[PDB]
Design a protein around this ligand. Structure first.
Ligand SMILES: CC(=O)N[C@H]1[C@H]([C@H](O)[C@H](O)COC(C)=O)O[C@@](O[C@H](CO)[C@@H](O)[C@@H]2O[C@@](O)(C(=O)O)C[C@H](O)[C@H]2NC(C)=O)(C(=O)O)C[C@@H]1O
Ligand SMILES: *[C@@H]1O[C@H](CO)[C@@H](O[C@@H]2O[C@H](CO)[C@@H](O[C@@H]3O[C@H](CO)[C@@H](O)[C@H](O)[C@@H]3O)[C@H](O)[C@H]2NC(C)=O)[C@H](O)[C@H]1NC(C)=O
Ligand SMILES: *[C@@H]1O[C@H](CO)[C@@H](O[C@@H]2O[C@H](CO)[C@@H](O)[C@H](O)[C@H]2NC(C)=O)[C@H](O)[C@H]1NC(C)=O
Ligand SMILES: *[C@@H]1O[C@H](CO)[C@@H](O[C@@H]2O[C@H](CO)[C@@H](O)[C@H](O)[C@H]2NC(C)=O)[C@H](O)[C@H]1NC(C)=O
Ligand SMILES: *[C@@H]1O[C@H](CO)[C@@H](O)[C@H](O)[C@H]1NC(C)=O
Ligand SMILES: *[C@@H]1O[C@H](CO)[C@@H](O)[C@H](O)[C@H]1NC(C)=O
Ligand SMILES: *[C@@H]1O[C@H](CO)[C@@H](O)[C@H](O)[C@H]1NC(C)=O
Ligand SMILES: *[C@@H]1O[C@H](CO)[C@@H](O)[C@H](O)[C@H]1NC(C)=O
Lengths: 129, 438, 48, 48, 48, 48, 96
C-alpha cells in the first residue's frame, strides 16, 4: 500500500532493492535473495566417499532446489545428511568427525551417531538410610 | 580497657545466596572468505585467486579458534563429571529433597529414558530469557528457507558466508552434567559432598566460620529454610534487572554486534565507484572493472583480517574465563578450599552450579549476620602457672564474672576447654591475667 | 517564509507507511551529531 | 541533498499593499541572491 | 567517508577496551574494600 | 589529489588497525595482572 | 593552551587526536581504599587481620612455620623491631 504515484522501488537502509511495483501491471512484489550456503563434508582416510551435511536444510529442499543425488539421505537435527546411516540411538565416547550438538559421524559405511564423551559411574546401592 | 577490647559479635544470622555467571564458551563464528569477498561473481573469484593464500589463512585461523573453543567445552564437561558416582536406584521424579532442603528446581531428568528433558527448572527459567542459545541459532537458520516475509539479519549474514555453528556438545548435554554433579551431593555415596550428607556438610561449614555446633544442630530447620529461601531468592532475582542475566545477554549482544559490523563492511565503497559487484560489472568492461573490483577485494580482505584479530583476542578471554569456571567447580562446588573470597564474597558456606547459555552459573551461599551485640573480649588469657591460652576461632569473654569462650561468628558463651583453646608454655605480654582459670 | 538551500547530510526517519516523520541536520549542533552517529532520534544514555 | 540549515532563519518576504508602492520594496534586502536554491514555507491566505 | 564504517570500528573497539579497564578498576577497588569495618573513633593523626 | 590522499588514508587506517590489534592484546595481559592482584589481596593481605 | 614555548609531545599527540583519558576512579580514591584496608588490620574489629591484634597474628603466622611460641612471645620487641626495619628497608630501597 506504500507506493505513491511517483514511486516504484522499495529500498532497505543499506541501499539494496527489496521490493518493486511493476510499471505495466501495477502488481507489487517483495524481492528475496536466492539461497547461498556451504556443505559440511565429513571424510575418513579409510573411506571411498564423503558424508555430506547441508546445515539447516530439509532434504526435500536440497533435492528439489539444489541437486538430485543417488545417495541415501535423512533429515537430522543439524540438517539433511547424505551417505550416512541414521543411528542416533547408538552412541560413541570418542569422535574424530564432530558435527555439533552432540552428533558425530563414525566410519566402519558412515554412521550418524550421538557423541557422549563422559559418563556417570553407577553403583546399585540404596539411596535411603 | 584493662586487657579487653570492644567487638560486635553476631547474635543472629541467615543464609544469603549470590549468583555468578562465568562465561566458558562463545558463538562459533565461521566465515567463507570466498563467498564473503566475491559473492557469486566469477570476475571477482578470478581476481581473488591471484591474491593466493589470504582466504586460506583466514579459514585456518578461524578453524584453530573454533578448535580451542571445542577443546575448552570438553575440558569443562570433564571437570563437571570428574569423580561423580550416582546410585542406579536414583529417580529424580521421586528423589528431590532431603533433610528439609529442597533441590527440585536444580535437578532435571536423570538417565536417557527422559531424553533431552535433562534441563532443570532453574536452567529452563535461565534459558527462556536468552533467544540466541545454541538451539536458538539452529532454529533461526532453519527458518532461512521457510519463505517468511521477516528479513532476519542472521539469514542475510549466512547468505553472505557469515554463520554461527553449534558447539560440539549441546547445552542439553551440559545441563545433564550439571544435573548429575548436583545430585552427587544429595544422596549416598555423596561423591561431590566430601562423602557425607549435604545438611551435615552445610552444618560443618557454618561451624568452621566460628559458630558453635550447639546452636546449629538445634536450629537445623531454620538453617534449611534459610537455605531454600536463598535459592528461591536467586530464582526470583532473574525477573528483575539481574547482573548475571545482563552479563549473559551481553555475550549474545557483543557477538551479534560484531557480525553486524562485519556484514556492514560489504556496503562500504573503499574508494571504488560502487560497493556492489553487480553495478561495477554492469558499468565497466574487464580492464577497468578489474581496477574497481581490486579496491573492493582489498577493503573486504582488510575487514576480515581485522575481524580475525579481534576474534583471536576475544577467545583468549574465553579460555581465561573457562579456566576460572573449572577452578570454581573444583574448589567451591565439589570441595571447599581454604581461600577466603575465591567462592564469592563474605563468609562462604557452600556453592552449587547450573548450566547457562555460553557458560556456567554458580550459586554461592554465605553466612550473613542479622543482628549484633557489642561485648568486651580478650584475645588470650594467662592462667595458673603463667601458662598462656588463646581462643580457637573465637574470644574469651567475662560472663557472670567468670571467664568463658565464645565463637567469633555467633555470640554463645560456653566453658573454656582444650576443645576451643590453643596452649602456650609461656603467656605473652598483655594477655589478661586469670590465675583462677583451670 | 524563505531560507537558503545548500548541500547537507541529513538523518531521515521513515515510518511504517513511508512518510518522513522526522529529520536531523547532522552538522547543525552537538546533539544532532550524536543522533546522526547513532542513526537514532533518541540516543542511549552515555558519554559521547 | 539540498536542505535548509537547521537553526538558520526564514525571512518573511511577503509584502501587502493597498494603493501606493514603495520603491524600497524593489531593492536589497527584498531582491535576494538565489545561489544553490531556496526553501519556501508559504501561508495559504484563505479569504471568503 | 567512502571508507564508511572503518573509523566507527576503531572507535567501537577502543570504547570496549576502555570499558574493560574501567570495569577492572572497579573490581579491584571492590576487592580492597570488601569486608572492611572501621571504628568511627579512628583518627590517623593520633593512632599510627 | 584524490589519488595521493587515498594512499595516505590507506596508510593511516592500516596503522590504526595495527595499533588497535596491539592494544587489545596488551589489555588482555592487564586483565590477567588485575585478576592476580585481586587474588593476592584476598589470599595474602586479608588472609593467609 | 598555557602559551608556553615548550613543545610537549603530549600536546602534539592531543592536537592529532591521540589522548589519554583519566581513569573513572582517581588514584587518590584508590590510595584511600588501600589506606582503609591497611588500618583494618591495626585496630578492633581487626576485619582484615582474622579478628585478632596484628602482633598476635604475626606471632601465630611465625609459629606456624615451626617456631616455638616461647621464643616468639619472649622476643616480641625484637620481632616488632625487625618488622618495622623491613618496612624502612623497602622505603629506602625505592631510592636505589
Ligand atoms: C508592506 C507593508 O508595509 N504592508 C502594510 C501596508 C503598507 O504599510 C501601506 O500600504 C504603505 O503605504 C504607502 C507605501 O504609502 O499597510 C497596511 O495597513 C494600512 C494602514 O497602514 C491599511 O489599514 C490601509 O489604511 C489606509 O488608511 C491607507 O490608505 O493606508 C486605508 C486603506 O483602505 C487600508 N487598507 C486596507 C483596507 O487594506 C495596508 O493594507 O495597506 C497593512 C500592510 O501589512
Ligand atoms: C531425619 O529423618 C527424618 C525421617 O527420615 C526426615 O524427615 C522427613 O523430612 C522430609 C523433608 O525433607 C519431610 O517432608 C515433608 O513432608 C510434608 C508432607 O508430609 C510436606 O508438606 C513438606 O513440604 C516436606 O516435603 C518428611 O515428611 C519427613 N518424614 C518424617 C517421617 O518425619 C528428616 O528430613 C531427616 N533429617 C533431619 C535433619 O531431620
Ligand atoms: C497503473 O497505475 C497507473 C497510475 O495510477 C494508472 O494510470 C492512470 O490511470 C488513470 C485512470 O485511467 C488516469 O486518470 C491517469 O491519467 C493515469 N496516469 C497516471 C500517471 O496517473 C494505470 O491506468 C494503471 N494500469 C493498470 C493496468 O492497472
Ligand atoms: C533417526 O533415528 C532415530 C533413532 O532410531 C529416530 O528416533 C526415534 O523415532 C521414533 C519414531 O518417531 C520414536 O518412537 C523414538 O522415540 C525416536 N528415538 C529417539 C532417540 O528420539 C528418528 O526418528 C530417525 N529420523 C529419521 C528422519 O530417520
Ligand atoms: C558410557 O556408557 C554407555 C552405556 O552404558 C557405554 O556404552 C559406553 O561404553 C560408556 N563410555 C564410557 C567412556 O564409560
Ligand atoms: C548389585 O550388583 C552386584 C553385582 O552385579 C550384585 O551381586 C548385587 O546382588 C546387586 N544388588 C542389587 C540390590 O541389585
Ligand atoms: C533471628 O532473626 C529472624 C528474622 O528476623 C527471627 O525470625 C528470629 O526470631 C531471630 N532469632 C533470634 C534468636 O533473635
Ligand atoms: C521459525 O518459523 C516458525 C514458522 O514461521 C515459527 O513458529 C518460529 O517461531 C520461528 N522461529 C524463529 C527463531 O524464527
Amino acid at each position: 500500500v506504500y507506493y505513491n504515484s511517483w514511486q516504484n522501488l522499495l529500498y532497505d537502509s543499506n541501499g539494496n532493492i527489496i521490493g518493486f511495483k511493476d510499471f505495466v501491471t501495477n502488481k507489487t512484489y517483495n524481492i528475496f535473495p536466492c539461497y547461498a550456503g556451504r556443505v559440511s563434508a565429513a571424510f575418513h582416510q579409510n573411506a571411498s566417499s564423503l558424508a555430506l551435511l547441508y546445515r539447516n536444510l530439509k532434504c526435500s529442499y536440497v533435492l528439489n532446489n539444489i541437486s538430485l543425488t543417488t545417495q541415501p539421505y535423512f533429515d537430522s537435527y543439524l540438517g539433511c545428511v547424505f551417505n550416512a546411516d541414521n543411528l542416533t540411538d547408538y552412541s560413541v565416547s570418542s569422535c574424530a568427525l564432530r558435527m555439533g550438538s552432540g552428533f558425530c559421524v563414525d566410519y566402519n559405511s558412515y554412521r550418524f551417531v550421538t557423541f557422549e564423551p563422559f559418563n556417570v559411574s553407577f553403583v546399585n546401592d540404596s539411596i535411603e538410610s | 580497657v584493662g586487657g579487653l577490647y570492644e567487638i560486635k559479635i553476631p547474635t543472629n544470622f541467615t543464609i544469603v545466596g549470590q549468583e555468578e555467571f562465568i562465561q566458558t564458551n562463545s558463538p562459533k563464528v565461521t566465515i567463507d572468505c570466498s563467498l564473503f569477498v566475491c559473492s557469486n561473481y566469477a570476475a571477482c573469484h578470478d581476481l581473488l585467486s591471484e591474491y593466493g593464500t589470504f582466504c586460506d589463512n583466514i579459514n585456518s585461523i578461524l578453524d584453530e579458534v573454533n578448535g580451542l573453543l571445542d577443546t575448552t567445552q570438553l575440558h569443562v564437561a570433564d571437570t563437571l563429571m570428574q569423580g561423580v558416582t550416582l546410585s542406579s536406584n536414583l529417580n529424580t521424579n521421586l528423589h528431590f529433597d532431603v533433610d528439609n532442603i529442597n533441590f527440585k528446581s536444580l535437578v532435571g531428568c536423570l538417565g536417557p529414558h527422559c531424553g533431552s528433558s535433562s534441563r532443570s527448572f532453574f536452567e529452563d527459567l535461565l534459558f527462556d530469557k536468552v533467544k540466541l542459545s545454541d538451539v536458538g541459532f539452529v532454529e533461526a537458520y532453519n527458518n532461512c528457507t521457510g519463505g517468511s516475509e521477516i528479513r532476519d539479519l542472521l539469514c542475510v549474514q549466512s547468505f553472505n558466508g557469515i554463520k554461527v555453528l553449534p558447539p560440539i556438545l549441546s547445552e542439553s548435554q551440559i545441563s545433564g552434567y550439571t544435573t548429575a554433579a548436583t545430585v552427587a551431593a544429595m544422596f549416598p555415596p555423596w561423591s561431590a559432598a566430601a562423602g557425607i550428607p549435604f545438611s551435615l556438610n552445610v552444618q560443618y561449614r557454618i561451624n568452621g566460620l566460628g559458630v558453635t555446633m550447639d546452636v546449629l544442630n538445634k536450629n537445623q530447620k531454620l538453617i534449611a529454610t534459610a537455605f531454600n529461601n536463598a535459592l528461591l531468592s536467586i530464582q526470583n532475582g532473574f525477573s528483575a534487572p539481574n547482573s548475571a542475566l545482563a552479563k549473559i545477554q551481553s555475550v549474545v549482544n557483543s557477538n551479534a554486534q560484531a557480525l553486524n559490523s562485519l556484514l556492514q563492511q560489504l556496503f562500504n565503497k573503499f574508494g571504488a565507484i560502487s560497493s556492489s559487484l553487480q553495478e561495477i560489472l554492469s558499468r565497466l568492461d574487464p580492464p577497468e572493472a578489474q581496477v574497481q573490483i581490486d579496491r573492493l577485494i582489498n577493503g573486504r580482505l582488510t575487514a576480515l583480517n581485522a575481524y580475525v584479530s579481534q576474534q583471536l583476542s576475544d577467545i583468549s578471554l574465553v579460555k581465561f574465563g573457562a579456566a576460572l569456571a573449572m577452578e570454581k567447580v573444583n574448589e567451591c562446588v565439589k570441595s571447599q578450599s581454604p581461600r577466603i573470597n575465591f567462592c564469592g564474597n563474605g563468609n562462604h558456606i557452600l556453592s552449587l552450579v547450573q548450566n547457562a547459555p555460553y557458560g556456567l552459573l554458580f550459586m554461592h551461599f554465605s553466612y550473613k549476620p542479622i543482628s549484633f551485640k557489642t561485648v568486651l573480649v580478650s584475645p588470650g588469657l594467662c592462667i595458673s602457672g603463667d601458662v598462656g591460652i588463646a581462643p580457637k576461632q573465637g574470644y574469651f569473654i567475662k560472663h557472670n564474672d567468670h571467664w568463658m569462650f565464645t565463637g567469633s561468628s555467633y555470640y554463645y558463651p560456653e566453658p573454656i576447654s582444650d576443645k576451643n583453646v590453643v596452649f602456650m608454655n609461656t603467656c605473652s605480654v598483655n594477655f589478661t591475667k586469670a590465675p583462677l582459670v583451670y | 517564509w524563505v531560507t537558503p538551500l545548500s548541500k547537507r547530510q541529513y538523518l531521515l526517519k521513515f515510518d511504517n507507511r513511508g512518510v518522513i516523520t522526522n529529520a536531523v541536520d547532522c552538522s547543525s549542533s552537538f546533539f544532532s551529531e550524536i543522533q546522526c552517529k547513532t542513526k537514532s532520534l533518541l540516543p542511549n544514555t552515555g558519554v559521547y | 541533498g539540498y536542505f535548509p540549515k537547521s537553526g538558520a532563519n526564514f525571512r518573511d518576504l511577503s509584502l501587502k499593499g493597498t494603493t501606493y508602492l514603495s520603491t524600497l520594496w524593489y531593492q536589497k534586502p527584498f531582491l535576494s541572491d538565489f545561489n544553490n536554491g531556496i526553501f519556501s514555507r508559504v501561508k495559504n491566505t484563505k479569504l471568503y
